[PDB]
RNA sequence: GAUGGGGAAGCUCCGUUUCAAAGGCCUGAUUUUAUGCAGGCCACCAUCGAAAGGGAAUCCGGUUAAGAUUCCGGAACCUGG
RNA sequence: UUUACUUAUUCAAUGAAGCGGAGCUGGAAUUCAUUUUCCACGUUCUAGCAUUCAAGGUCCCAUUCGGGGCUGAUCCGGGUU
């Protein structure tokens, strides 16, 4: 205590070389790195078709738990499940001439582009999830408008991962749902209300709103200084 | 399936959101590499079209040509 | 996200560098010893000059190989010989062999050792 | 038929500077938060002569804001400048000899050295052994000062384009006649191979325009169109006039 | 010098072979006379306000 | 004069630190092994380019038909350990 | 034709270090005393020195070594300028 003693550092101009300080804000970063910054903020920089930017609508985190919940009820055959099934079908049906039905009917969320696409196109899916981060875009900007006009209900998901998780895939880009078991078809009523309320019901008014267009932080704030000033007066 | 929409849509270029997407993508472009390895095509439908299959020994290349 | 990184550079991270572990040996038979002692002395020098070394400055005169260097010579002659060695001296002859002088130690007699290798 | 001596000069084969025993590019601080927003005391460690170059150069040390070590930069010297002086170099330093300001922190009539064309540029005007810029005024509203440069031209500048506080040291060098081939050799060698020029009126009609003719002579007007091509622009390039200078300059 | 004992490359003083006898000492007399200096100094600006 | 990049139908050209994720040498701990995870310090950069530039350190005497600051005798020195 | 915007494109620099917007404090104008406005924001007798996650302050653990967090050094936007 009599010891040491206080000997504050003047970090002024010209004085006591600066300590380290967190720089990250000015970190050369990878081209990798500022080409993806880059690209995300010239997505929004231009404005937006509204073909695109509808899918800047997602579902809440409230009703995108919900149908993953219910989702979930229904994911298809692991590779070891689908053995046990081929084992307890043959070891039934060879010995007892049934004609392979040792297994009861199954009941799985429907995957794949083409094939949801095809299932829209048939008015067989109840309920299409459709990825917000398909990074070829054209590959599901068809859709929202696809299951408009066939009369399917479809909601603007947050996560090819998190459908890539349902379908025991890395990605999946979508989820459909044709059947739904009995217990479960009341549970999927409510949720396709929730989600025809946010998305096909809005479909008709966010067809016509442009994306984008919005400015970075400082150009912001010298907008907001020059409306302020000039419109403000 | 998805291919024909893909492919129908490829076709107005001109529309607003494929100007968008034009703008966008050859902005990208334009900054990687002059070529440089596509990690997949950006057209599957006109990739199958023309061959490609979506299996190990398949590979897209993006390049930037001087016009 | 929010790590502190105080410096506005950035270093290419180091990651796991794992050893070869090959599927196959390269080679499959290690080559032999290229240069043994037998190859290393390829013959002792005859002359005049260098029977006059042998008998009077204690120095064994042999051809060696061009590749080898003094330290492979006086482990070679070493070996063959059973002799310590004080000193190599190596020159490249005019024909494109390597002479090799090779000075013993005083214990040794290279004459006696001249002998018994068979040139008098 | 033969490529002309200016043309030649592009290739910079034998036409390139002679850099050898020169002490580094002169060059103001690089443009940073300290002389953005106060100052920086630097020390004049020496004044050297620099080969090739008529005007002496400034070594002055700074400490690294940064990182504990020194920085040494190498400054054209201002008339008045010493060994030992303390250098300031930022928007704060004081209106003194060899300070180094903004254009927009000097009032009208300062008289500054090696201005900045753009801000951070370290330096592109008035370094040349005696000259100087003037600051004519300042443009506060769309910041800028206008200044006079030592052609006589008028420059409006970005208000944040620094200038060192005096003149260019080795002034009059110029009032020297140079009496001697020898000296204008000793000249050139430090700085490049342009020395010393054959007339073309002198050589052949292969070797220039102005070659050849049974008495040297031109044989058409030396006044070249600005549109000519390589080849071509010898003699006065777009001359907007000729003959003895008579009368006044600083046209309006 | 570095076939050579510290003693022959050194003298025994605040900057040995680095610095002149007369150098150091100025260098004493302005760490001192500058430090004082700063120390008025700060008096006169605490008490100036 | 490679690389990173860019140009060129292309042989190749430009450029040489440049619009590059270009790093090894140190060590608390780890010593499930002085490493990987895991504490922390330094990078605006290949390489080639001089038998007259820079540069660690050897001299004398003797010796051969022909080698000598190299061999022999004696006496030193430098570098790395 | 003239004007605005910035993300394309272009120029420049840096080890992409302090940018933009707020706020604190300090000599002020006045308020509807909400709130409005502006300036500055640790360095200028001297050829010294300025580096070890900065001492200090505060908090936690864990003990003989100390180790860590915050503040010191305001907050927010990650647009390097
Ligand atoms: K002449
Ligand atoms: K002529
Ligand atoms: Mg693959
Ligand atoms: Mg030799
Ligand atoms: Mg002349
Ligand atoms: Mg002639
Ligand atoms: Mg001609
Ligand atoms: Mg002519
Ligand atoms: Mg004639
Ligand atoms: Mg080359
Ligand atoms: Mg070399
Ligand atoms: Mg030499
Ligand atoms: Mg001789
Ligand atoms: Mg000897």
Same mark, same amino acid.
């Given at each position: 205590?009599?010891?040491?003693?206080?000997?504050?550092?003047?970090?002024?101009?010209?004085?006591?070389?600066?300590? /380290?300080?967190?720089?990250?804000?000015?970190?050369?970063?990878?081209?990798?790195?500022?080409?993806?910054?880059?690209?995300?903020?010239?997505?929004?920089?231009?404005?937006?078709?509204?073909?695109?930017?509808?899918?800047?609508?997602?579902?809440?985190?409230?009703?995108?738990?919900?149908? @993953?919940?219910?989702?979930?009820?229904?994911?298809?055959?692991?590779? =070891?499940?689908?053995?046990?099934?081929?084992?307890?079908?043959?070891?039934? !049906?060879?010995? #007892?001439?049934?004609?392979?039905?040792?297994?009861?009917?199954?009941?799985?969320?429907?995957?794949?582009?083409?094939?949801? %696409?095809?299932?829209?196109?048939?008015?067989?899916?109840?309920?299409?999830?459709?990825?917000?981060?398909?990074?070829?875009?054209?590959?599901?900007?068809?859709?929202?408008?696809?299951?408009?006009?066939?009369? %399917?209900?479809?909601?603007? !998901?947050?996560?090819?991962?998190?459908?890539?998780?349902?379908?025991?895939?890395?990605?999946?880009?979508?989820?459909?749902?044709?059947?739904?078991?009995? $217990?479960?078809?009341?549970?999927?009523?409510?949720?396709?209300?929730?989600?025809?309320?946010?998305?096909?019901?809005?479909?008709? $008014?966010?067809?016509?709103?442009?994306?984008?267009?919005?400015?970075?932080?400082? =150009?912001?704030?010298?907008?907001?200084?020059?409306?302020?000033?000039?419109?403000?007066? | 399936?998805?291919?024909?929409?893909? $492919?129908?849509?490829?076709?107005?270029?001109?529309?607003?959101?494929?100007?968008?997407?034009?703008?966008?993508?050859?902005?990208?472009?334009?900054?990687?590499?002059?070529?440089?390895?596509?990690?997949?095509?950006?057209?599957?439908?006109?990739?199958?079209?023309?061959?490609?299959?979506?299996?190990?020994? @398949?590979?897209?290349?993006?390049?930037?040509?001087?016009? | 996200?929010?790590?502190?990184?105080?410096?506005?550079?950035?270093?290419?991270?180091?990651?796991?560098?794992?050893?070869?572990?090959?599927?196959?040996?390269?080679?499959?038979?290690?080559?032999?010893?290229?240069?043994?002692?037998?190859?290393?002395?390829?013959?002792?020098?005859?002359?005049?000059?260098?029977?006059?070394?042998?008998?009077?400055?204690?120095?064994? %005169? @042999?051809?060696?190989?061009?590749? =080898?260097?003094?330290?492979?010579?006086?482990?070679?002659?070493?070996?063959?010989?059973?002799?310590?060695?004080?000193?190599?001296?190596?020159?490249?002859?005019?024909?494109?062999? /390597?002479?090799?002088?090779?000075?013993?130690?005083?214990?040794?007699?290279?004459?006696?050792?001249?002998?018994?290798?068979?040139?008098? | 038929?033969?490529?002309?001596?200016?043309?030649?000069?592009?290739?910079?084969?034998? @036409?390139?500077?002679?850099?050898?025993?020169?002490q580094g590019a002169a060059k103001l601080r690089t443009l940073?938060?300290?002389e953005?927003?106060?100052y920086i005391?630097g020390?004049v460690?020496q004044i050297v002569h620099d080969?090739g170059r008529g005007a002496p150069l400034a070594k002055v040390?700074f400490?690294?804001?940064?990182?504990?070590?020194?920085?040494?930069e190498i400054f054209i010297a201002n008339e008045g400048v010493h060994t030992?002086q303390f250098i300031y170099a930022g928007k704060?330093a004081s209106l003194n000899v060899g300070n180094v300001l903004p254009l927009g922190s000097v009032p009208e009539g300062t008289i500054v050295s090696n201005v900045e064309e753009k801000p951070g540029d370290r330096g592109a005007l008035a370094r040349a052994s005696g000259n100087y810029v003037i600051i004519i005024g300042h443009?506060?509203?769309?910041?800028?000062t206008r200044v006079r440069l030592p052609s006589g031209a008028k420059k409006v500048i970005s208000s944040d384009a620094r200038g060192v506080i005096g003149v260019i040291a080795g002034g009059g060098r110029v009032?020297?006649?140079?009496?001697?081939?020898?000296? =204008?050799?000793?000249?050139?060698?430090?700085?490049?191979?342009?020395?010393?020029?054959?007339?073309?009126?002198?050589?052949?009609?292969?070797?220039?325009?102005?070659? #050849?003719?049974?008495?040297?002579?031109?044989?058409?007007?030396?006044?070249?169109?600005? #549109?000519?091509?390589?080849?071509?622009?010898?003699?006065?390039?777009?001359?907007?006039?000729?003959?003895?200078?008579?009368?006044?300059?600083?046209?309006? | 010098?570095?076939?050579?004992?510290?003693?022959? /490359?050194?003298?025994?003083?605040?900057?040995?072979?680095?610095?002149?006898?007369?150098?150091?000492?100025?260098?004493?007399?302005?760490?001192?006379?500058? $430090?004082?200096?700063?120390?008025?100094?700060?008096?006169?600006?605490?008490?100036?306000?």
């Amino acid at each position: 205590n009599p010891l040491t003693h206080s000997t504050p550092k003047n970090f002024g101009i010209g004085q006591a070389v600066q300590p /380290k300080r967190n720089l990250s804000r000015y970190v050369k970063w990878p081209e990798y790195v500022r080409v993806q910054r880059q690209k995300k903020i010239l997505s929004i920089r231009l404005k937006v078709p509204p073909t695109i930017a509808q899918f800047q609508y997602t579902l809440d985190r409230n009703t995108a738990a919900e149908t @993953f919940k219910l989702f979930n009820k229904y994911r298809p055959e692991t590779a =070891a499940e689908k053995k046990e099934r081929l084992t307890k079908e043959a070891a039934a !049906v060879a010995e #007892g001439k049934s004609k392979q039905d040792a297994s009861p009917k199954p009941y799985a969320v429907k995957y794949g582009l083409n094939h949801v %696409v095809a299932l829209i196109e048939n008015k067989k899916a109840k309920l299409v999830l459709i990825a917000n981060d398909v990074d070829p875009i054209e590959l599901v900007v068809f859709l929202p408008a696809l299951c408009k006009k066939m009369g %399917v209900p479809y909601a603007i !998901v947050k996560g090819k991962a998190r459908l890539g998780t349902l379908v025991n895939q890395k990605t999946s880009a979508v989820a459909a749902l044709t059947e739904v078991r009995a $217990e479960d078809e009341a549970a999927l009523a409510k949720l396709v209300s929730t989600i025809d309320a946010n998305f096909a019901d809005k479909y008709d $008014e966010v067809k016509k709103h442009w994306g984008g267009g919005i400015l970075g932080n400082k =150009a912001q704030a010298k907008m907001d200084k020059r409306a302020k000033n000039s419109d403000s007066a | 399936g998805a291919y024909k929409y893909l $492919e129908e849509l490829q076709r107005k270029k001109q529309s607003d959101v494929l100007r968008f997407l034009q703008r966008v993508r050859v902005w990208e472009y334009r900054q990687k590499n002059v070529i440089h390895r596509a990690a997949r095509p950006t057209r599957p439908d006109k990739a199958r079209r023309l061959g490609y299959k979506a299996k190990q020994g @398949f590979v897209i290349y993006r390049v930037r040509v001087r016009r | 996200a929010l790590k502190v990184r105080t410096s506005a550079t950035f270093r290419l991270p180091k990651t796991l560098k794992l050893a070869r572990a090959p599927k196959y040996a390269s080679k499959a038979v290690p080559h032999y010893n290229r240069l043994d002692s037998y190859k290393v002395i390829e013959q002792p020098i005859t002359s005049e000059t260098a029977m006059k070394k042998v008998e009077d400055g204690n120095i064994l %005169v @042999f051809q060696v190989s061009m590749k =080898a260097n003094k330290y492979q010579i006086k482990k070679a002659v070493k070996e063959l010989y059973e002799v310590d060695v004080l000193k190599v001296n190596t020159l490249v002859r005019p024909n494109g062999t /390597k002479k090799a002088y090779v000075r013993l130690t005083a214990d040794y007699d290279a004459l006696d050792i001249a002998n018994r290798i068979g040139y008098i | 038929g033969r490529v002309i001596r200016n043309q030649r000069k592009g290739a910079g084969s034998i @036409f390139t500077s002679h850099t050898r025993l020169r002490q580094g590019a002169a060059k103001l601080r690089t443009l940073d938060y300290a002389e953005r927003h106060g100052y920086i005391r630097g020390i004049v460690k020496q004044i050297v002569h620099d080969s090739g170059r008529g005007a002496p150069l400034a070594k002055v040390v700074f400490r690294d804001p940064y990182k504990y070590r020194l920085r040494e930069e190498i400054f054209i010297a201002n008339e008045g400048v010493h060994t030992g002086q303390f250098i300031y170099a930022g928007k704060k330093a004081s209106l003194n000899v060899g300070n180094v300001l903004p254009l927009g922190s000097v009032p009208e009539g300062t008289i500054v050295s090696n201005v900045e064309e753009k801000p951070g540029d370290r330096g592109a005007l008035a370094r040349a052994s005696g000259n100087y810029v003037i600051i004519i005024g300042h443009n506060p509203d769309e910041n800028k000062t206008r200044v006079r440069l030592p052609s006589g031209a008028k420059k409006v500048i970005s208000s944040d384009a620094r200038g060192v506080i005096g003149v260019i040291a080795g002034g009059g060098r110029v009032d020297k006649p140079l009496l001697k081939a020898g000296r =204008a050799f000793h000249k050139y060698r430090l700085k490049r191979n342009s020395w010393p020029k054959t007339r073309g009126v002198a050589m052949n009609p292969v070797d220039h325009p102005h070659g #050849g003719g049974n008495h040297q002579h031109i044989g058409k007007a030396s006044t070249i169109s600005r #549109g000519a091509v390589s080849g071509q622009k010898a003699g006065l390039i777009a001359a907007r006039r000729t003959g003895l200078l008579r009368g006044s300059q600083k046209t309006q | 010098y570095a076939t050579v004992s510290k003693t022959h /490359k050194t003298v025994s003083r605040a900057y040995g072979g680095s610095r002149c006898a007369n150098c150091v000492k100025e260098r004493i007399i302005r760490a001192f006379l500058i $430090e004082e200096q700063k120390i008025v100094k700060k008096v006169v600006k605490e008490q100036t306000e």
